[PDB]
Amino acid sequence: SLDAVGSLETKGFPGVLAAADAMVKTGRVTLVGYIRAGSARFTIIIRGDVSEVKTAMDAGIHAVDKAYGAALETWVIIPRPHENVECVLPIAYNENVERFREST
Template sequence: MPAAVGTIETLGFPAVLAAADAMVKAGSVTLVYYGLAESGQFIVSVRGRVSEVKIAVAAGIEAGEAAYGGQVITHYIIPNPTENVEDVLPIEYTAKVERFRE
C-alpha cells in the first residue's frame, strides 16, 4: 500500500519530542525516523495514508511550536514516494517499527 511521508524539522529536542508525540496521537501514522540534523536541529518522520499524514503533521507543527522554546524550522509531506526515494532515504518501515503499523 502506498504511504505518504511527513517530516518536521525543529530547533531543540523538546520541540521534536512534542511534535513526534502529537503526530502519532493525532493520526494513524507510524514513526519511521528520528535524527539530529545539525546545530540542535532535529528531524522526525512518519508514514501512513496521505490524509492521516496531513493531520499528523499539522498536529506536530502546532505541538512543536507550543513546546517551551520550541521552533518548527520546516516541514514537508511527500504523498506516495517512489521506490527510488524509499531505497535511498531512511523512510522505510523497518522491523523495529513494523509492529506499530496498522
C-alpha cells in the first residue's frame, strides 16, 4: 500500500494503549501492529491517508500524557513508503485488520 505510515513509541505499555485508541478514534486510520522494542518501550504503527495520519498522530501524542507515568519517546510520519520498506519492516496492512481498513 502507498498509504502513509505513522509510528509512535512510548515508555510503558499503558502509554501506547492510550495513543493507539486516540489515533484510531480521531483519524480515518488503521492500527496495523505493535512492537515490543525492549527496555519497556512499545511501538505502534498506523496506516492511512497522509492527512488522516497527521490528525491521528497529533491525537496520539496528546493521549500519551493521559497515561500516568507514560513517556513519549519518538515518532515519525512517512507520507508514502517504498514497497521494500513495507515488506521488510512490520508496517504493512494484514488480514487481521482488513475490516478496519475497509472502514476508513
